[PDB]
Symmetry: C2
Subunit: 309 residues, 2 copies
């Protein structure tokens, strides 16, 4: 699988990323902090986000060292955002095992250590990007709160939400790899486009595969729902209004929702949009050097839609 070949190809660099994470997560006087952090990185992830920073830098010819610092920074930011989102992966969250108190404060420690780590690079431009990505994640989550169970939510808004909470960190991760590696700006832009597109595809694929039924029960406005609402008639408008905007769900509803999406072609529409975004990601890669990592990133983008091809 592509994430496995990536991990093999980046093995040396990931050992250093792991060591930097260990070094910066430390706390002499609050063990809770690395304790809480150990769990979360010890129990979760293909670690795609730090790997994308490393791969992007190596792909544009950079031999190190500061792509490792940025990859660790990216992973700390991802981890911090997860801790705050929970106030997981079929295991007790930190907020339940300790308290909301712990999710919040450990996340804060990680966010700060990530920013402190980024300064070692001396590169103002990557630091501006990663600070912005963190801001955008927080803003996207606030907008998701705002627009929740709201039928006026458009595709455009959904795209902004998903870029917010998922795509912005992927696009930042890849972009700062190109920048730290000194890539020409066409290639920096392409790397940003690749990560952005990959992040969107991942999220759309998750939302398609749900329809299992957890997003429905949560009354989530994900893409196939949004497409089905816009095309709703008089009766279909009432069915969405009831089960999404009012939460009154009964047996048969999930199947009816799936029946309406199929009727309006919006599950296939969502699936092809996801494929579409993987195509857009792969297209951006054609601007990058012909390096074995480029093929691995091409494969990774294909892999995103492997279950739905």
């Amino acid at each position: 699988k592509p994430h496995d070949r990536l991990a093999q190809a980046l093995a040396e660099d990931m050992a250093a990323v792991n060591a930097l994470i260990r070094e910066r997560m430390s706390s002499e006087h609050a063990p809770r902090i690395p304790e809480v952090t150990a769990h979360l990185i010890e129990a979760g992830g293909k670690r795609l986000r730090p790997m994308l920073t490393l791969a992007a830098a190596r792909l544009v010819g950079y031999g190190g060292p500061f792509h490792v610092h940025l990859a660790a920074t990216v992973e700390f930011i991802h981890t911090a955002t997860l801790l705050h989102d929970d106030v997981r992966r079929g295991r007790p969250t930190a907020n339940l095992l300790w308290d909301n108190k712990s999710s919040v404060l450990v996340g804060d420690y990680l966010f700060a250590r990530s920013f402190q780590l980024m300064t070692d690079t001396g590169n103002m431009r990557v630091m501006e990007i990663l600070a912005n990505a963190s801001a955008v994640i927080a803003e996207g989550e606030v907008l998701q709160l705002t627009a929740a169970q709201n039928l006026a939510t458009t595709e455009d808004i959904y795209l902004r939400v998903i870029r917010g909470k998922t795509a912005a960190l992927f696009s930042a991760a890849t972009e700062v790899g190109g920048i730290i590696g000194g890539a020409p700006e066409d290639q920096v832009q392409a790397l940003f486009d690749y990560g952005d597109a990959l992040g969107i595809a991942f999220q759309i694929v998750d939302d398609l595969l749900d329809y299992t039924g957890d997003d429905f029960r949560e009354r989530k406005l994900t893409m196939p729902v949004i497409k089905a609402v816009a095309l709703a008639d008089e009766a279909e408008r009432a069915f969405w209004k009831r089960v999404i905007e009012k939460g009154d769900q009964q047996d048969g509803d999930l199947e009816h929702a799936m029946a309406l999406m199929t009727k309006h072609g919006t599950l296939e529409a969502t699936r092809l949009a996801a494929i579409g975004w993987t195509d857009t990601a792969r297209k951006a890669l054609a601007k990058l050097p012909d390096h074995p990592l480029r093929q691995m990133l091409d494969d990774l983008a294909d892999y995103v839609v492997e279950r739905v091809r």
Copy 2:
């Protein structure tokens, strides 16, 4: 003292206010500045950004980046407050409802995160990696001090050294960062940077000890409006730690009951205050606070004899004015 210093820094503080309003804005999530507005327009003496401005101008800096740094210090403080209120799930701040009450915990968490991020984004405009590393570290140290405060609470083994670590992390670290970065941005000699750091560290320590003292009615041990929160939360602060260290077997059982077990009943705050008074621990905490202002004042001696140096000297008096005898 707060107001003289404020009037001398009026123009810079206007520029700080402006950058804050500009960077707390959100094009996609209006709740963010609504929530931020609601914390900043709820009073606050704004000592922390003043400390940065004063330090930079004291070493002869003409701008512009002391404004950026002062705004960042305030963003960090504001984010810290928003998160401290989710953590102990507080209903009021400065007599008005908290962001988390008015909205929800997730909002106060996410707004604090937004401001924290924007503040680091802003710092990159300065091009100075050193001050960025300092302010990042201080942010980490704040979070760490807050986690330490949690493990220290309910725990009678907490020592004065641990307490000093908690307050240094939670409170002093940002005061010391604030002054230090002002010296650095102004290109001051490293001995002046260190003196500004030491000034800020001592003042911040004094500042927290004064709050902890006033929480138990001050030297006189008098019950009023702003007393009893630390006792209810079973925090191990100086006046408690000192009384616990002097406790005989029966007194220790009282402290065990009300602090460790948390079985607090009517009259128990006043009983605690009576033990503090018997053991001289409120006066002792007063002395610790005024001692730290001595240390702060001594640190100033290495700085140039500028009107701002004298105003920082008066500010040290001001921080302990409420416990003067």
